Design a protein around this ligand. Structure first.
Ligand SMILES: O=C(N[C@@H]1c2ccccc2-c2c(-c3nc4cc(F)ccc4[nH]3)cccc21)c1ccnc2[nH]ccc12
Length: 207
């Protein structure tokens, strides 16, 4: 396990998301499903030129997995996934410029719900989660685990868990007062409101 420091801008954004009073927290799911859909578009598009891109799995889908025992909501996709270089470097560049643009817009009067327009909608996970674990597998790299509870750092290690084939798992370790996002009726309601026309099958698992 390797530990990395967030740049000051992204650390400030994570603190704003955690500390700001903002009741419309449900938008985190729209943001994560949108990132999953974008990752699925990306591998689908690459496969149009190189069909072997799907040797790591033909199914293009999104699964929503609640676990009341662990207090986790997991979003699974069979999209493009992220390499080690994506997790540490490439996405750090995106997070930096996206945060700057979002913070400027927020000071001007934009709302937290508009976070996705800045390419940093992933960080809306911290509206409901005290810790986020990302398990990911990209065709060009090994399976990795990225994780952060904010506090200014994140970790990256090769993941020894169940081999995914290709894609991303976003594990949301929910805050104690955010357990409504583990309830079937609540997740169904949110998906219907914000994500009813996503071009991939979204399966809401139950317990
Ligand atoms: O949401 C994704 N990736 C997000 C993302 C987005 C924007 C900025 C940063 C990050 C990010 C990061 C990340 N943020 C960083 C911020 C830094 F300061 C330095 C390195 C960083 N790495 C780590 C894991 C996952 C993601 C993502 C990508 C592909 N397939 C996916 N399926 C579901 C989500 C998902």
């Amino acid at each position: 396990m390797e530990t990395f420091a967030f740049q000051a801008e992204i650390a400030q954004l994570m603190s704003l998301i955690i500390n700001t009073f903002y009741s419309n927290k449900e938008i985190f799911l729209r943001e994560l499903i949108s990132n999953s859909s974008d990752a699925l578009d990306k591998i689908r598009y690459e496969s149009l030129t190189d069909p072997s891109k799907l040797d790591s799995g033909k199914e293009l889908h999104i699964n929503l997995i609640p676990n009341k025992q662990d207090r986790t909501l997991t979003i699974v996709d069979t999209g493009i996934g992220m390499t080690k270089a994506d997790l540490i470097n490439n996405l750090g560049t995106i997070a930096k410029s996206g945060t700057k643009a979002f913070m400027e817009a927020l000071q001007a009067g934009a709302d937290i719900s508009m976070i996705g327009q800045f390419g940093v909608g992933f960080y809306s996970a911290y509206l409901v989660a005290e810790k986020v674990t990302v398990i990911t597998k990209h065709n060009d790299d090994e399976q990795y685990a990225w994780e952060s509870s904010a506090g200014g750092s994140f970790t990256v290690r090769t993941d020894t868990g169940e081999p995914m084939g290709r894609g991303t798992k976003v594990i949301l370790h929910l805050k104690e007062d955010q357990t409504e996002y583990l309830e079937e009726r609540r997740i169904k309601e949110i998906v219907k409101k914000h994500s009813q026309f996503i071009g991939y099958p979204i399966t809401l698992f139950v317990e």
